[PDB]
Amino acid sequence: TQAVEAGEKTVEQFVQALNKGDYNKAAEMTSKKAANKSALSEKEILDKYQNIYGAADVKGLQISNLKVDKKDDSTYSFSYKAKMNTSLGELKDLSYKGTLDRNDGQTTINWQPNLVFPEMEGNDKVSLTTQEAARGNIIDRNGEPLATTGKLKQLGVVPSKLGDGGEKTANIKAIASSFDLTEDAINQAISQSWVQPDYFVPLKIIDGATPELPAGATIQEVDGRYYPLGEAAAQLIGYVGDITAEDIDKNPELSSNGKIGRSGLEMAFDKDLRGTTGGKLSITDADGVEKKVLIEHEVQNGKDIKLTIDAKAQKTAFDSLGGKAGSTVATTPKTGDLLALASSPSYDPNKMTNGISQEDYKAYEENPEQPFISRFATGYAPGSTFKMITAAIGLDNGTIDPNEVLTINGLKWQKDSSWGSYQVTRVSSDVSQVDLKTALIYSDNIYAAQETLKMGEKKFRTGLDKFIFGEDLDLPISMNPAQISNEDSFNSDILLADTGYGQGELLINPIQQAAMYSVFANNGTLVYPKLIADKETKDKKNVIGETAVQTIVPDLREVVQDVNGTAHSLSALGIPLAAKTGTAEIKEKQDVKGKENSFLFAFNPDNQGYMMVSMLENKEDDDSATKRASELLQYLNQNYQ
Ligand SMILES: *C(=O)[C@@H](NC(=O)Cc1ccccc1)[C@@H]1N[C@@H](C(=O)O)C(C)(C)S1
């Protein structure tokens, strides 16, 4: 019993070395090679575990129900149950048996082939057959493909079928101008270290009709992931890349020959899309004939994922951004169906997944406008659009009377001289008697600032805490919860007023904005947005009063219909619109000289069919989200009542 304690420790140390992948330490715990002792030397045990466990990608060896007895002055037997993870799943309920050896002072293990796998005897071999699973598709709300696997034609050249130095240099220029490729880059491709004369060096993937093939140009059909919308949904969908050896070490169920989602929904739904590897893990005898099947199951393809996205709305929303920095979110506000999640500028997902040069990839990362950012999931200051919420809160707690006129003379105002040089600014001084309808049409920041200070921080945060601030939305998109300020108290009348017109320490991403503003399409009920089609419509009752909704929405119509409304350019559509524009100022967020973001909110006040929140980040002069909304508003109005 004094030595049985060391035997149970030796078996525990041996399993840990196998689990940790250090087969040399596990082999050094075995006795000398002899009959009725260890069956192989330390190096022979190392090369057998490295072969068998390495082939099946064994990871996470865990044991239980250990028992170590005695049988002689040196023969102590042990037994335990174990489970392990392989390329074909978990191998559980394994019965292991063996004997330890207590000689001299230390206790070792009489190694046997049955300690690799239970029923292995002598010179038995192990074989592994696998069949890769087909990756599932990502489809929109009407079944249109957003991410699928198809047969893409690949362009490539064979250096031997080119020329001889003089005739070769002519076809390189001929094959470069007929496919829009840099002639200096084609020579770069056939100059890689892996290239041989009679090899097919791939160049690009033709996404259309195949032109004329010069001397040495060949087209080979290959299978790969394809994104029909390309840039228009690259941030949302993402891309898949080659699976590396480090990916297999973290999850051996992955197919070494397959693709893995690197970003977007391809990565978020990688498990459901990649399926399960089929095949058989069996123990053969010395000749190679099967004698024991450890694991076997049929290949299961990946499940399709159906989104609430409208492909025609996703493409239109992205194209309307004209390559500028910004994003657009379109929802059906009564249910929360995310119709479009566009972010601009964007990258080419087909280029990323079908091989891309380190220059084009560095161009994406060195781009100042940062196309890799999912801007619909990035928090921004809401802008003057937030005045809708501030007004609704003031109407609910009785601070704001819709017909009461505040006297606002000039273009600047401050509470007292304690504000120093800071003054809430105004765009027009033509209306000195300002009511709620006037303040929403002209976007009067002074009105919102005075009513917020009159409301007070306590009453303002009471209505704000009824929204989704600090909540993690149940969406497969990585985002941080919205915030009112950095701390739980403004501790500043200036910050309280700035938050009043949506320009304080507020941080709300476009998706969360569409969630908050949905109260104006559901009589004060907040409807959470959903991206997966089969999910249930979750809402939140009594966020703002229905009395406030029936007061603000008529004024939001006037933001479009009134001749001095900030969204009057949208009245050309001739459709029922309720809108609220916004322009936020960001001063040296990193460091600059003054950048401003443009915002637009709009929805149908008659049928509540659609809702839209578009924005431009670091906008150019005379550019805005309202300028670019006619096309998307037209489509959403006709197709979503
Ligand atoms: C809300 O966002 C308000 N914006 C400002 O006070 C900042 C600003 C930025 C550029 C020029 C002037 C003022 C108001 N809303 C916007 C808008 O709705 O477009 C206005 C420009 C009307 S000021």
PDB file of C-alpha atoms in Angstrom, residues 35-276:
ATOM      1  CA  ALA A  35       9.199 -10.350 -22.201  1.00  0.00           C
ATOM      2  CA  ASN A  36       6.465  -9.657 -19.620  1.00  0.00           C
ATOM      3  CA  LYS A  37       7.898  -6.151 -19.127  1.00  0.00           C
ATOM      4  CA  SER A  38       7.756  -3.381 -21.747  1.00  0.00           C
ATOM      5  CA  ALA A  39       7.173  -4.474 -25.334  1.00  0.00           C
ATOM      6  CA  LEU A  40       9.185  -1.697 -27.021  1.00  0.00           C
ATOM      7  CA  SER A  41      12.037   0.677 -26.276  1.00  0.00           C
ATOM      8  CA  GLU A  42      11.533   4.340 -25.412  1.00  0.00           C
ATOM      9  CA  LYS A  43      12.211   5.443 -28.993  1.00  0.00           C
ATOM     10  CA  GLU A  44       9.971   2.704 -30.406  1.00  0.00           C
ATOM     11  CA  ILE A  45       7.119   3.782 -28.120  1.00  0.00           C
ATOM     12  CA  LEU A  46       7.675   7.411 -29.148  1.00  0.00           C
ATOM     13  CA  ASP A  47       7.441   6.568 -32.851  1.00  0.00           C
ATOM     14  CA  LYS A  48       4.292   4.480 -32.370  1.00  0.00           C
ATOM     15  CA  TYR A  49       2.292   7.067 -30.413  1.00  0.00           C
ATOM     16  CA  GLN A  50       3.452   9.801 -32.803  1.00  0.00           C
ATOM     17  CA  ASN A  51       2.282   7.718 -35.772  1.00  0.00           C
ATOM     18  CA  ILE A  52      -1.061   6.457 -34.460  1.00  0.00           C
ATOM     19  CA  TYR A  53      -2.149   9.389 -32.287  1.00  0.00           C
ATOM     20  CA  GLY A  54      -0.804  11.797 -34.903  1.00  0.00           C
ATOM     21  CA  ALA A  55      -2.774  10.156 -37.711  1.00  0.00           C
ATOM     22  CA  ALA A  56      -6.084  10.245 -35.817  1.00  0.00           C
ATOM     23  CA  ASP A  57      -5.265  13.703 -34.366  1.00  0.00           C
ATOM     24  CA  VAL A  58      -5.796  12.446 -30.823  1.00  0.00           C
ATOM     25  CA  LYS A  59      -6.324  15.277 -28.340  1.00  0.00           C
ATOM     26  CA  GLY A  60      -7.623  15.493 -24.788  1.00  0.00           C
ATOM     27  CA  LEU A  61      -6.960  12.083 -23.247  1.00  0.00           C
ATOM     28  CA  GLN A  62      -8.907  11.905 -19.975  1.00  0.00           C
ATOM     29  CA  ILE A  63      -9.237   8.890 -17.684  1.00  0.00           C
ATOM     30  CA  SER A  64     -11.522   7.800 -14.854  1.00  0.00           C
ATOM     31  CA  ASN A  65     -12.239   4.846 -12.554  1.00  0.00           C
ATOM     32  CA  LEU A  66      -8.577   4.102 -11.850  1.00  0.00           C
ATOM     33  CA  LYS A  67      -7.656   1.020  -9.816  1.00  0.00           C
ATOM     34  CA  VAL A  68      -4.135  -0.158  -8.939  1.00  0.00           C
ATOM     35  CA  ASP A  69      -3.705  -3.452  -7.058  1.00  0.00           C
ATOM     36  CA  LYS A  70      -0.807  -5.885  -6.505  1.00  0.00           C
ATOM     37  CA  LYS A  71       0.135  -9.301  -7.856  1.00  0.00           C
ATOM     38  CA  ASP A  72       3.770  -9.906  -6.874  1.00  0.00           C
ATOM     39  CA  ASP A  73       6.766  -8.325  -5.166  1.00  0.00           C
ATOM     40  CA  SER A  74       7.175  -6.192  -8.313  1.00  0.00           C
ATOM     41  CA  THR A  75       4.052  -6.732 -10.482  1.00  0.00           C
ATOM     42  CA  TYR A  76       1.319  -4.185  -9.720  1.00  0.00           C
ATOM     43  CA  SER A  77      -1.628  -4.271 -12.122  1.00  0.00           C
ATOM     44  CA  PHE A  78      -3.740  -1.264 -13.081  1.00  0.00           C
ATOM     45  CA  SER A  79      -6.930  -0.575 -15.020  1.00  0.00           C
ATOM     46  CA  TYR A  80      -8.962   2.491 -15.943  1.00  0.00           C
ATOM     47  CA  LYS A  81     -11.555   3.863 -18.348  1.00  0.00           C
ATOM     48  CA  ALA A  82     -10.619   6.618 -20.784  1.00  0.00           C
ATOM     49  CA  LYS A  83     -12.051   8.936 -23.422  1.00  0.00           C
ATOM     50  CA  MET A  84     -10.307  10.805 -26.224  1.00  0.00           C
ATOM     51  CA  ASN A  85     -11.087  13.117 -29.137  1.00  0.00           C
ATOM     52  CA  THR A  86     -10.079  12.143 -32.674  1.00  0.00           C
ATOM     53  CA  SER A  87     -10.625  13.315 -36.253  1.00  0.00           C
ATOM     54  CA  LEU A  88     -13.975  11.461 -36.178  1.00  0.00           C
ATOM     55  CA  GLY A  89     -15.279  12.624 -32.800  1.00  0.00           C
ATOM     56  CA  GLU A  90     -14.980  11.421 -29.224  1.00  0.00           C
ATOM     57  CA  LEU A  91     -13.935   7.822 -28.513  1.00  0.00           C
ATOM     58  CA  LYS A  92     -15.502   7.077 -25.125  1.00  0.00           C
ATOM     59  CA  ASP A  93     -15.896   4.086 -22.800  1.00  0.00           C
ATOM     60  CA  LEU A  94     -12.432   2.658 -23.480  1.00  0.00           C
ATOM     61  CA  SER A  95     -11.304  -0.195 -21.216  1.00  0.00           C
ATOM     62  CA  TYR A  96      -7.552  -0.057 -20.552  1.00  0.00           C
ATOM     63  CA  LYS A  97      -5.554  -2.712 -18.707  1.00  0.00           C
ATOM     64  CA  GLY A  98      -1.894  -3.086 -17.841  1.00  0.00           C
ATOM     65  CA  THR A  99       0.710  -3.805 -15.194  1.00  0.00           C
ATOM     66  CA  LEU A 100       3.253  -1.586 -13.454  1.00  0.00           C
ATOM     67  CA  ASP A 101       6.732  -2.556 -12.276  1.00  0.00           C
ATOM     68  CA  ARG A 102       8.247  -1.608  -8.910  1.00  0.00           C
ATOM     69  CA  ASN A 103      12.000  -2.230  -9.041  1.00  0.00           C
ATOM     70  CA  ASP A 104      14.896  -0.553  -7.227  1.00  0.00           C
ATOM     71  CA  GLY A 105      13.205   2.638  -6.041  1.00  0.00           C
ATOM     72  CA  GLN A 106      10.979   4.050  -8.783  1.00  0.00           C
ATOM     73  CA  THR A 107       7.863   2.563 -10.376  1.00  0.00           C
ATOM     74  CA  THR A 108       7.468   2.333 -14.160  1.00  0.00           C
ATOM     75  CA  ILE A 109       4.858   0.937 -16.558  1.00  0.00           C
ATOM     76  CA  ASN A 110       5.142  -2.352 -18.428  1.00  0.00           C
ATOM     77  CA  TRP A 111       4.172  -0.855 -21.781  1.00  0.00           C
ATOM     78  CA  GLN A 112       2.115  -2.924 -24.219  1.00  0.00           C
ATOM     79  CA  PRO A 113       0.426  -2.173 -27.560  1.00  0.00           C
ATOM     80  CA  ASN A 114      -2.936  -2.293 -25.758  1.00  0.00           C
ATOM     81  CA  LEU A 115      -2.044   1.059 -24.150  1.00  0.00           C
ATOM     82  CA  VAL A 116      -2.343   2.787 -27.530  1.00  0.00           C
ATOM     83  CA  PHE A 117      -5.814   1.354 -28.200  1.00  0.00           C
ATOM     84  CA  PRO A 118      -7.534  -1.261 -26.014  1.00  0.00           C
ATOM     85  CA  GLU A 119      -7.585  -4.304 -28.326  1.00  0.00           C
ATOM     86  CA  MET A 120      -4.198  -3.804 -30.021  1.00  0.00           C
ATOM     87  CA  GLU A 121      -1.956  -6.878 -29.748  1.00  0.00           C
ATOM     88  CA  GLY A 122       1.642  -7.197 -30.915  1.00  0.00           C
ATOM     89  CA  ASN A 123       2.291  -5.700 -34.361  1.00  0.00           C
ATOM     90  CA  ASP A 124      -1.244  -4.519 -35.126  1.00  0.00           C
ATOM     91  CA  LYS A 125      -1.676  -1.488 -37.378  1.00  0.00           C
ATOM     92  CA  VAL A 126      -4.170   1.385 -37.397  1.00  0.00           C
ATOM     93  CA  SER A 127      -5.893   2.808 -40.479  1.00  0.00           C
ATOM     94  CA  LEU A 128      -7.965   5.980 -40.828  1.00  0.00           C
ATOM     95  CA  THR A 129     -10.275   6.771 -43.743  1.00  0.00           C
ATOM     96  CA  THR A 130     -12.036  10.137 -43.928  1.00  0.00           C
ATOM     97  CA  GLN A 131     -14.505  11.836 -46.269  1.00  0.00           C
ATOM     98  CA  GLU A 132     -14.750  15.625 -46.217  1.00  0.00           C
ATOM     99  CA  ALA A 133     -18.192  17.128 -45.634  1.00  0.00           C
ATOM    100  CA  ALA A 134     -19.714  19.664 -48.010  1.00  0.00           C
ATOM    101  CA  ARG A 135     -19.982  23.113 -46.449  1.00  0.00           C
ATOM    102  CA  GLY A 136     -23.521  24.379 -45.990  1.00  0.00           C
ATOM    103  CA  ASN A 137     -24.926  27.424 -47.743  1.00  0.00           C
ATOM    104  CA  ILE A 138     -25.927  30.856 -46.449  1.00  0.00           C
ATOM    105  CA  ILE A 139     -29.148  32.033 -48.092  1.00  0.00           C
ATOM    106  CA  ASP A 140     -31.294  35.148 -47.823  1.00  0.00           C
ATOM    107  CA  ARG A 141     -34.982  35.381 -46.885  1.00  0.00           C
ATOM    108  CA  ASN A 142     -36.096  34.245 -50.366  1.00  0.00           C
ATOM    109  CA  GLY A 143     -33.519  31.489 -50.916  1.00  0.00           C
ATOM    110  CA  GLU A 144     -31.048  33.536 -52.957  1.00  0.00           C
ATOM    111  CA  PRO A 145     -27.419  32.447 -52.432  1.00  0.00           C
ATOM    112  CA  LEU A 146     -25.247  34.651 -50.233  1.00  0.00           C
ATOM    113  CA  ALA A 147     -22.470  32.109 -49.600  1.00  0.00           C
ATOM    114  CA  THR A 148     -22.345  28.812 -51.490  1.00  0.00           C
ATOM    115  CA  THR A 149     -19.954  26.255 -52.971  1.00  0.00           C
ATOM    116  CA  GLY A 150     -19.824  26.200 -56.767  1.00  0.00           C
ATOM    117  CA  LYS A 151     -17.620  25.256 -59.710  1.00  0.00           C
ATOM    118  CA  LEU A 152     -15.496  28.306 -60.517  1.00  0.00           C
ATOM    119  CA  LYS A 153     -13.328  28.347 -63.634  1.00  0.00           C
ATOM    120  CA  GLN A 154      -9.668  29.106 -62.910  1.00  0.00           C
ATOM    121  CA  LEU A 155      -7.223  30.831 -65.259  1.00  0.00           C
ATOM    122  CA  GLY A 156      -3.651  29.573 -65.401  1.00  0.00           C
ATOM    123  CA  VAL A 157      -0.600  29.272 -67.619  1.00  0.00           C
ATOM    124  CA  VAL A 158       1.848  26.459 -68.372  1.00  0.00           C
ATOM    125  CA  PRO A 159       5.413  27.770 -68.900  1.00  0.00           C
ATOM    126  CA  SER A 160       6.357  24.968 -71.308  1.00  0.00           C
ATOM    127  CA  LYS A 161       3.484  25.803 -73.695  1.00  0.00           C
ATOM    128  CA  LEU A 162       4.570  29.463 -73.809  1.00  0.00           C
ATOM    129  CA  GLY A 163       7.648  30.078 -75.954  1.00  0.00           C
ATOM    130  CA  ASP A 164      11.436  30.105 -75.676  1.00  0.00           C
ATOM    131  CA  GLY A 165      12.569  33.522 -74.400  1.00  0.00           C
ATOM    132  CA  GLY A 166      11.508  35.534 -77.427  1.00  0.00           C
ATOM    133  CA  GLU A 167       8.155  33.958 -78.229  1.00  0.00           C
ATOM    134  CA  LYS A 168       7.484  33.491 -74.503  1.00  0.00           C
ATOM    135  CA  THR A 169       7.754  37.205 -73.679  1.00  0.00           C
ATOM    136  CA  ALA A 170       5.170  37.949 -76.385  1.00  0.00           C
ATOM    137  CA  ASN A 171       2.476  35.601 -75.060  1.00  0.00           C
ATOM    138  CA  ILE A 172       2.947  36.907 -71.509  1.00  0.00           C
ATOM    139  CA  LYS A 173       1.965  40.349 -72.792  1.00  0.00           C
ATOM    140  CA  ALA A 174      -0.827  38.746 -74.831  1.00  0.00           C
ATOM    141  CA  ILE A 175      -2.202  36.748 -71.881  1.00  0.00           C
ATOM    142  CA  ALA A 176      -1.960  39.786 -69.584  1.00  0.00           C
ATOM    143  CA  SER A 177      -4.058  42.257 -71.599  1.00  0.00           C
ATOM    144  CA  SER A 178      -6.829  39.791 -72.516  1.00  0.00           C
ATOM    145  CA  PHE A 179      -7.653  39.097 -68.842  1.00  0.00           C
ATOM    146  CA  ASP A 180      -6.695  42.450 -67.222  1.00  0.00           C
ATOM    147  CA  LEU A 181      -3.582  41.281 -65.401  1.00  0.00           C
ATOM    148  CA  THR A 182      -0.236  42.956 -64.779  1.00  0.00           C
ATOM    149  CA  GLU A 183       2.319  41.576 -67.233  1.00  0.00           C
ATOM    150  CA  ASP A 184       5.009  42.106 -64.588  1.00  0.00           C
ATOM    151  CA  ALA A 185       2.921  39.972 -62.205  1.00  0.00           C
ATOM    152  CA  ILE A 186       2.483  37.007 -64.563  1.00  0.00           C
ATOM    153  CA  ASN A 187       6.264  36.607 -64.625  1.00  0.00           C
ATOM    154  CA  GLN A 188       6.146  36.890 -60.827  1.00  0.00           C
ATOM    155  CA  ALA A 189       3.712  33.958 -60.738  1.00  0.00           C
ATOM    156  CA  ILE A 190       5.765  31.591 -62.918  1.00  0.00           C
ATOM    157  CA  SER A 191       8.882  32.534 -60.932  1.00  0.00           C
ATOM    158  CA  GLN A 192       7.814  31.058 -57.587  1.00  0.00           C
ATOM    159  CA  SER A 193      10.009  28.399 -56.006  1.00  0.00           C
ATOM    160  CA  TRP A 194       7.411  25.637 -56.466  1.00  0.00           C
ATOM    161  CA  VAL A 195       7.112  26.147 -60.235  1.00  0.00           C
ATOM    162  CA  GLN A 196       8.246  23.511 -62.735  1.00  0.00           C
ATOM    163  CA  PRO A 197       8.230  23.826 -66.561  1.00  0.00           C
ATOM    164  CA  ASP A 198       5.284  21.502 -67.271  1.00  0.00           C
ATOM    165  CA  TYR A 199       3.174  22.834 -64.389  1.00  0.00           C
ATOM    166  CA  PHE A 200      -0.163  24.655 -64.288  1.00  0.00           C
ATOM    167  CA  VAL A 201       0.512  27.928 -62.453  1.00  0.00           C
ATOM    168  CA  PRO A 202      -2.881  29.396 -61.446  1.00  0.00           C
ATOM    169  CA  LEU A 203      -3.462  33.104 -62.020  1.00  0.00           C
ATOM    170  CA  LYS A 204      -7.028  34.374 -61.460  1.00  0.00           C
ATOM    171  CA  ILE A 205     -10.625  33.157 -61.280  1.00  0.00           C
ATOM    172  CA  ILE A 206     -12.837  34.204 -64.190  1.00  0.00           C
ATOM    173  CA  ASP A 207     -16.224  35.339 -62.866  1.00  0.00           C
ATOM    174  CA  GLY A 208     -17.785  35.571 -66.338  1.00  0.00           C
ATOM    175  CA  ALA A 209     -17.369  34.418 -69.914  1.00  0.00           C
ATOM    176  CA  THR A 210     -14.023  32.947 -70.929  1.00  0.00           C
ATOM    177  CA  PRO A 211     -12.199  35.092 -73.533  1.00  0.00           C
ATOM    178  CA  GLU A 212      -9.623  33.911 -76.064  1.00  0.00           C
ATOM    179  CA  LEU A 213      -6.802  31.815 -74.619  1.00  0.00           C
ATOM    180  CA  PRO A 214      -3.324  32.786 -75.897  1.00  0.00           C
ATOM    181  CA  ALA A 215      -0.376  30.407 -76.310  1.00  0.00           C
ATOM    182  CA  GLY A 216      -0.216  28.635 -72.949  1.00  0.00           C
ATOM    183  CA  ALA A 217      -3.455  29.804 -71.298  1.00  0.00           C
ATOM    184  CA  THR A 218      -5.572  26.985 -69.857  1.00  0.00           C
ATOM    185  CA  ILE A 219      -8.863  26.990 -67.947  1.00  0.00           C
ATOM    186  CA  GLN A 220      -9.457  24.324 -65.290  1.00  0.00           C
ATOM    187  CA  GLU A 221     -12.752  23.883 -63.447  1.00  0.00           C
ATOM    188  CA  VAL A 222     -12.304  23.708 -59.665  1.00  0.00           C
ATOM    189  CA  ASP A 223     -14.674  23.790 -56.700  1.00  0.00           C
ATOM    190  CA  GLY A 224     -14.564  26.532 -54.087  1.00  0.00           C
ATOM    191  CA  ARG A 225     -16.566  28.916 -51.959  1.00  0.00           C
ATOM    192  CA  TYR A 226     -18.397  31.612 -53.921  1.00  0.00           C
ATOM    193  CA  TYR A 227     -20.067  34.834 -52.771  1.00  0.00           C
ATOM    194  CA  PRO A 228     -22.628  36.123 -55.304  1.00  0.00           C
ATOM    195  CA  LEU A 229     -22.831  39.638 -53.826  1.00  0.00           C
ATOM    196  CA  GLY A 230     -19.085  40.083 -53.242  1.00  0.00           C
ATOM    197  CA  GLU A 231     -18.274  43.406 -51.598  1.00  0.00           C
ATOM    198  CA  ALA A 232     -21.944  44.214 -50.943  1.00  0.00           C
ATOM    199  CA  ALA A 233     -22.040  41.673 -48.086  1.00  0.00           C
ATOM    200  CA  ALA A 234     -18.368  40.972 -47.308  1.00  0.00           C
ATOM    201  CA  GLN A 235     -18.463  42.321 -43.744  1.00  0.00           C
ATOM    202  CA  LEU A 236     -21.652  40.439 -42.852  1.00  0.00           C
ATOM    203  CA  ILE A 237     -20.988  37.121 -44.599  1.00  0.00           C
ATOM    204  CA  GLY A 238     -17.211  37.023 -44.246  1.00  0.00           C
ATOM    205  CA  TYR A 239     -14.852  34.614 -45.953  1.00  0.00           C
ATOM    206  CA  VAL A 240     -13.379  31.146 -45.493  1.00  0.00           C
ATOM    207  CA  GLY A 241      -9.683  30.326 -45.601  1.00  0.00           C
ATOM    208  CA  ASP A 242      -7.414  27.308 -45.740  1.00  0.00           C
ATOM    209  CA  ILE A 243      -7.393  25.239 -42.555  1.00  0.00           C
ATOM    210  CA  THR A 244      -3.958  25.235 -40.924  1.00  0.00           C
ATOM    211  CA  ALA A 245      -2.204  22.691 -38.725  1.00  0.00           C
ATOM    212  CA  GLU A 246      -2.811  25.000 -35.759  1.00  0.00           C
ATOM    213  CA  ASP A 247      -6.552  24.941 -36.474  1.00  0.00           C
ATOM    214  CA  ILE A 248      -6.499  21.133 -36.330  1.00  0.00           C
ATOM    215  CA  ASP A 249      -4.626  21.186 -33.017  1.00  0.00           C
ATOM    216  CA  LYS A 250      -7.380  23.324 -31.463  1.00  0.00           C
ATOM    217  CA  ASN A 251     -10.202  21.238 -32.988  1.00  0.00           C
ATOM    218  CA  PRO A 252      -9.375  17.893 -34.637  1.00  0.00           C
ATOM    219  CA  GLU A 253     -12.933  17.511 -35.961  1.00  0.00           C
ATOM    220  CA  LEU A 254     -12.026  20.057 -38.651  1.00  0.00           C
ATOM    221  CA  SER A 255     -11.215  18.700 -42.103  1.00  0.00           C
ATOM    222  CA  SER A 256      -7.521  19.167 -42.892  1.00  0.00           C
ATOM    223  CA  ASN A 257      -8.497  19.528 -46.576  1.00  0.00           C
ATOM    224  CA  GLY A 258     -11.456  21.856 -45.961  1.00  0.00           C
ATOM    225  CA  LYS A 259     -12.030  25.556 -45.365  1.00  0.00           C
ATOM    226  CA  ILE A 260     -12.727  27.368 -42.090  1.00  0.00           C
ATOM    227  CA  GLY A 261     -14.661  30.589 -41.589  1.00  0.00           C
ATOM    228  CA  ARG A 262     -12.283  33.424 -40.726  1.00  0.00           C
ATOM    229  CA  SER A 263     -14.731  36.311 -40.223  1.00  0.00           C
ATOM    230  CA  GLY A 264     -18.377  37.287 -40.458  1.00  0.00           C
ATOM    231  CA  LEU A 265     -21.133  34.686 -40.480  1.00  0.00           C
ATOM    232  CA  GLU A 266     -18.844  32.089 -42.077  1.00  0.00           C
ATOM    233  CA  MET A 267     -16.908  32.041 -38.799  1.00  0.00           C
ATOM    234  CA  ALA A 268     -19.895  32.619 -36.501  1.00  0.00           C
ATOM    235  CA  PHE A 269     -21.756  29.633 -37.998  1.00  0.00           C
ATOM    236  CA  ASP A 270     -18.668  27.576 -38.854  1.00  0.00           C
ATOM    237  CA  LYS A 271     -19.835  24.558 -36.841  1.00  0.00           C
ATOM    238  CA  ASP A 272     -23.267  24.347 -38.483  1.00  0.00           C
ATOM    239  CA  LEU A 273     -21.866  25.057 -41.957  1.00  0.00           C
ATOM    240  CA  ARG A 274     -18.859  22.706 -42.000  1.00  0.00           C
ATOM    241  CA  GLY A 275     -20.809  19.570 -41.125  1.00  0.00           C
ATOM    242  CA  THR A 276     -19.168  16.460 -39.686  1.00  0.00           C
TER     243      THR A 276
END
